Design a protein around this ligand. Structure first.
Ligand SMILES: CCOc1ccc2nc(S(N)(=O)=O)sc2c1
Ligand SMILES: [Zn+2]
Length: 259
């Protein structure tokens, strides 16, 4: 194949042609069967410690919109949960659908949400850089958050209005002072399991922490996401929607629940 994406010919069903781990045994996302999750009271409490999160840029890369963070210090970290130590926040990005019915990567008891946020952290204690950690075992901790449609979300206009600046693939804009505290739900309950990156290279490097409680945005904010393009300034315009990987087989992994 010549590239990867979400189209008919370059989409998730074909990724295995370039990325054979696509058919491996620790692949994400999965369908979370709520009643087959194993309670785990032994888990430490999940601490998204984001007080000094210092944002740097927002970028459309042809697959998602993505915001990066400085990660020179252990300032912005996730700790506790199933994590044997702290992980430095690198970036967040979203996945979403054509319609309300689809868009999220993980499903709960067969049910999709219209979007899913992924906060990507790395193990800077063990590994020297993020690209290294990104393909190593226990290199990453990804926290996912579903999004339903409902009433408005104020903190999430600063993000959503910036989407106009970065609408073509390849465009990057300064994005200072966005703290992602404002994208987290009240509850810190979660499911966790070992899995992979959901886009190439699909490395089996991820401890997934999926939050139980979603955040709400308005159909209106949701629509601004759909006004992004997969494609660059000098090509035919194809809007970014259905940029998600379906659930993958569990092949015997344990999904722990913290509640
Ligand atoms: C250095 C390679 O960086 C990568 C590549 C793919 C990738 N996919 C995810 S996701 N959708 O959070 O599971 S984070 C990530 C980081
Ligand atoms: Zn993702």
């Amino acid at each position: 194949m010549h590239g990867w994406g979400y189209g008919q010919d370059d989409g998730p069903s074909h990724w295995h042609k370039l990325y054979p781990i696509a058919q491996g045994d620790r692949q994400s996302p999965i369908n979370i069967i709520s009643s087959q999750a194993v309670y785990s009271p032994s888990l430490q409490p999940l601490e998204l410690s984001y007080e000094a999160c210092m944002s740097l840029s927002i970028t459309n890369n042809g697959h998602s919109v993505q915001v990066d963070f400085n990660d020179s210090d252990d300032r912005t970290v996730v700790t506790g949960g199933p994590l044997e130590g702290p992980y430095r926040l690198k970036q967040f990005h979203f996945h979403w659908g054509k319609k309300h019915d689809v868009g999220s990567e993980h499903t709960v008891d067969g049910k999709s949400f219209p979007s899913e946020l992924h906060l990507v952290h790395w193990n800077a204690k063990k590994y020297s850089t993020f690209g290294e950690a990104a393909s190593a075992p226990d290199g990453l901790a990804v926290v996912g958050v579903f999004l339903e449609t409902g009433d408005e979300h104020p903190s999430m206009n600063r993000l959503t209005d910036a989407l106009y600046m970065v609408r073509f693939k390849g465009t990057k804009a300064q994005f200072s002072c966005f703290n992602p505290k404002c994208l987290l739900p009240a509850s810190r309950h979660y499911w966790t399991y070992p899995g992979s990156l959901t886009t190439p290279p699909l490395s089996e490097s991820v401890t997934w922490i999926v939050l139980r409680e979603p955040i709400c945005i308005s159909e209106r904010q949701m629509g601004k996401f759909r006004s992004l393009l997969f494609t660059s300034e000098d090509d035919e315009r194809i809007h970014m929607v259905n940029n998600f990987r379906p659930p993958q087989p569990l092949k015997g992994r344990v999904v722990k629940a913290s509640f």
